[PDB]
Design a protein around this ligand. Structure first.
Ligand SMILES: [Mg+2]
Length: 179
Protein backbone atom coordinates (compact mmCIF):
# COMPACT_ATOMS: atom_id res chain seq x y z
CA UNK A 1 0.00 0.00 0.00
CA UNK A 2 1.14 3.53 0.91
CA UNK A 3 -0.36 4.63 -2.40
CA UNK A 4 -3.69 6.30 -3.04
CA UNK A 5 -5.92 6.19 -6.10
CA UNK A 6 -7.70 9.44 -6.85
CA UNK A 7 -10.57 9.47 -9.29
CA UNK A 8 -13.19 11.77 -10.70
CA UNK A 9 -16.01 11.27 -13.19
CA UNK A 10 -18.34 13.46 -15.23
CA UNK A 11 -21.92 12.28 -15.66
CA UNK A 12 -25.00 13.06 -17.69
CA UNK A 13 -26.84 13.75 -14.45
CA UNK A 14 -27.26 12.96 -10.75
CA UNK A 15 -29.45 9.85 -10.85
CA UNK A 16 -27.13 6.98 -9.84
CA UNK A 17 -29.65 4.57 -11.40
CA UNK A 18 -30.33 6.20 -14.79
CA UNK A 19 -27.51 8.63 -15.63
CA UNK A 20 -24.22 7.68 -17.29
CA UNK A 21 -20.48 8.20 -16.85
CA UNK A 22 -19.21 10.32 -19.78
CA UNK A 23 -15.66 10.98 -18.60
CA UNK A 24 -13.16 9.45 -16.21
CA UNK A 25 -9.66 10.24 -14.98
CA UNK A 26 -7.41 8.76 -12.32
CA UNK A 27 -4.22 9.75 -10.54
CA UNK A 28 -2.00 7.74 -8.25
CA UNK A 29 -0.21 9.57 -5.42
CA UNK A 30 1.89 8.32 -2.52
CA UNK A 31 0.62 8.55 1.07
CA UNK A 32 2.10 12.06 1.34
CA UNK A 33 0.04 13.28 -1.62
CA UNK A 34 2.87 13.46 -4.16
CA UNK A 35 1.68 12.62 -7.67
CA UNK A 36 3.37 9.44 -8.91
CA UNK A 37 1.45 9.05 -12.19
CA UNK A 38 -1.56 10.32 -14.13
CA UNK A 39 -3.92 7.71 -15.56
CA UNK A 40 -5.80 7.74 -18.86
CA UNK A 41 -8.36 10.50 -19.28
CA UNK A 42 -11.21 9.10 -21.36
CA UNK A 43 -14.44 10.57 -22.70
CA UNK A 44 -17.07 7.87 -23.30
CA UNK A 45 -19.12 7.53 -26.48
CA UNK A 46 -22.74 8.61 -26.09
CA UNK A 47 -25.35 9.69 -28.63
CA UNK A 48 -26.12 13.34 -29.33
CA UNK A 49 -29.67 12.52 -28.17
CA UNK A 50 -28.36 11.53 -24.75
CA UNK A 51 -26.39 14.77 -24.38
CA UNK A 52 -29.29 17.05 -25.24
CA UNK A 53 -31.40 15.13 -22.73
CA UNK A 54 -29.23 16.51 -19.94
CA UNK A 55 -30.29 19.44 -17.73
CA UNK A 56 -29.20 22.96 -18.62
CA UNK A 57 -26.21 23.76 -16.43
CA UNK A 58 -24.88 20.34 -17.43
CA UNK A 59 -25.18 21.07 -21.15
CA UNK A 60 -23.59 24.52 -20.84
CA UNK A 61 -20.73 23.29 -18.65
CA UNK A 62 -19.77 20.35 -20.90
CA UNK A 63 -20.13 22.54 -24.00
CA UNK A 64 -17.80 25.20 -22.62
CA UNK A 65 -15.24 22.63 -21.41
CA UNK A 66 -15.28 20.83 -24.75
CA UNK A 67 -16.28 17.51 -23.20
CA UNK A 68 -19.47 17.58 -25.27
CA UNK A 69 -17.45 17.30 -28.47
CA UNK A 70 -15.10 14.67 -27.02
CA UNK A 71 -18.11 12.48 -26.17
CA UNK A 72 -19.59 12.59 -29.68
CA UNK A 73 -16.15 11.97 -31.24
CA UNK A 74 -15.23 9.21 -28.80
CA UNK A 75 -14.85 5.60 -29.88
CA UNK A 76 -14.34 4.36 -26.29
CA UNK A 77 -17.05 2.36 -24.48
CA UNK A 78 -17.55 1.95 -20.74
CA UNK A 79 -15.95 -1.50 -20.84
CA UNK A 80 -12.96 -0.18 -22.78
CA UNK A 81 -12.37 2.74 -20.43
CA UNK A 82 -12.69 0.38 -17.46
CA UNK A 83 -10.15 -2.03 -18.89
CA UNK A 84 -7.59 0.68 -19.64
CA UNK A 85 -7.91 2.25 -16.20
CA UNK A 86 -7.55 -1.09 -14.43
CA UNK A 87 -4.45 -1.78 -16.55
CA UNK A 88 -2.99 1.62 -15.63
CA UNK A 89 -3.64 0.99 -11.94
CA UNK A 90 -2.16 -2.50 -12.13
CA UNK A 91 1.28 -0.96 -12.56
CA UNK A 92 1.15 0.92 -9.25
CA UNK A 93 -0.95 -0.96 -6.70
CA UNK A 94 -2.67 -4.30 -6.15
CA UNK A 95 -6.45 -4.54 -6.07
CA UNK A 96 -8.26 -3.93 -2.78
CA UNK A 97 -5.42 -1.92 -1.24
CA UNK A 98 -6.39 1.72 -1.77
CA UNK A 99 -9.55 3.54 -0.67
CA UNK A 100 -11.37 5.58 -3.32
CA UNK A 101 -10.10 9.15 -3.02
CA UNK A 102 -11.73 12.35 -4.26
CA UNK A 103 -14.62 14.77 -3.70
CA UNK A 104 -18.12 13.41 -3.11
CA UNK A 105 -16.84 9.97 -4.03
CA UNK A 106 -19.79 8.05 -2.61
CA UNK A 107 -21.70 9.33 -5.63
CA UNK A 108 -18.88 8.26 -7.94
CA UNK A 109 -18.69 4.80 -6.38
CA UNK A 110 -22.39 4.22 -6.97
CA UNK A 111 -21.93 5.06 -10.65
CA UNK A 112 -18.90 2.75 -10.94
CA UNK A 113 -20.80 -0.05 -9.23
CA UNK A 114 -23.33 -0.05 -12.06
CA UNK A 115 -21.27 0.77 -15.18
CA UNK A 116 -17.69 -0.25 -14.26
CA UNK A 117 -17.91 -3.04 -11.66
CA UNK A 118 -14.43 -4.41 -12.20
CA UNK A 119 -12.96 -0.97 -11.48
CA UNK A 120 -15.23 -0.46 -8.48
CA UNK A 121 -14.04 -3.75 -6.96
CA UNK A 122 -10.43 -2.73 -7.58
CA UNK A 123 -10.92 -0.28 -4.72
CA UNK A 124 -10.92 -1.01 -1.00
CA UNK A 125 -14.47 -0.57 0.34
CA UNK A 126 -13.27 2.45 2.30
CA UNK A 127 -13.65 5.99 0.95
CA UNK A 128 -11.40 9.00 1.51
CA UNK A 129 -13.68 11.97 0.80
CA UNK A 130 -12.21 15.46 0.88
CA UNK A 131 -15.80 16.73 1.22
CA UNK A 132 -15.86 15.45 4.80
CA UNK A 133 -13.04 17.81 5.69
CA UNK A 134 -14.63 20.63 3.73
CA UNK A 135 -17.80 20.15 5.78
CA UNK A 136 -15.86 20.31 9.05
CA UNK A 137 -13.92 23.42 8.03
CA UNK A 138 -17.16 25.09 7.04
CA UNK A 139 -18.68 24.46 10.46
CA UNK A 140 -15.62 24.86 12.71
CA UNK A 141 -13.01 26.96 10.88
CA UNK A 142 -14.62 28.91 7.99
CA UNK A 143 -11.52 31.04 7.41
CA UNK A 144 -9.57 27.92 6.34
CA UNK A 145 -11.52 27.77 3.06
CA UNK A 146 -10.60 31.30 1.93
CA UNK A 147 -7.11 30.18 0.95
CA UNK A 148 -8.16 27.68 -1.71
CA UNK A 149 -9.80 28.13 -5.10
CA UNK A 150 -10.53 25.43 -7.70
CA UNK A 151 -8.86 25.55 -11.12
CA UNK A 152 -10.66 27.25 -14.00
CA UNK A 153 -10.20 23.93 -15.81
CA UNK A 154 -13.14 21.61 -16.42
CA UNK A 155 -11.90 18.16 -17.51
CA UNK A 156 -11.91 15.30 -15.00
CA UNK A 157 -8.10 15.28 -14.86
CA UNK A 158 -7.99 18.83 -13.49
CA UNK A 159 -10.85 18.10 -11.08
CA UNK A 160 -9.02 15.17 -9.50
CA UNK A 161 -5.89 17.30 -9.57
CA UNK A 162 -7.82 19.96 -7.63
CA UNK A 163 -9.04 17.43 -5.08
CA UNK A 164 -5.45 16.50 -4.19
CA UNK A 165 -4.46 20.17 -3.89
CA UNK A 166 -7.51 20.86 -1.75
CA UNK A 167 -6.58 18.17 0.76
CA UNK A 168 -2.97 19.38 0.59
CA UNK A 169 -4.27 22.83 1.53
CA UNK A 170 -6.40 21.60 4.46
CA UNK A 171 -3.55 19.45 5.77
CA UNK A 172 -1.66 22.64 6.70
CA UNK A 173 -4.37 23.57 9.20
CA UNK A 174 -4.94 20.08 10.65
CA UNK A 175 -2.33 20.26 13.41
CA UNK A 176 -1.12 16.96 14.85
CA UNK A 177 -3.46 14.94 12.62
CA UNK A 178 -1.97 16.67 9.59
CA UNK A 179 1.37 15.15 10.52
MG1 LIG B 1 -16.56 14.62 -9.02
Amino acid sequence: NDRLIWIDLEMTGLDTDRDSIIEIATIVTDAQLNVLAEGPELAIAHSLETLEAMDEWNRNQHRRSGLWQRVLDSQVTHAQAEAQTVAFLGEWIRAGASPMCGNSICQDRRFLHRQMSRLERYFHYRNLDVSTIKELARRWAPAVASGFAKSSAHTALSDVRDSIDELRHYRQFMGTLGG
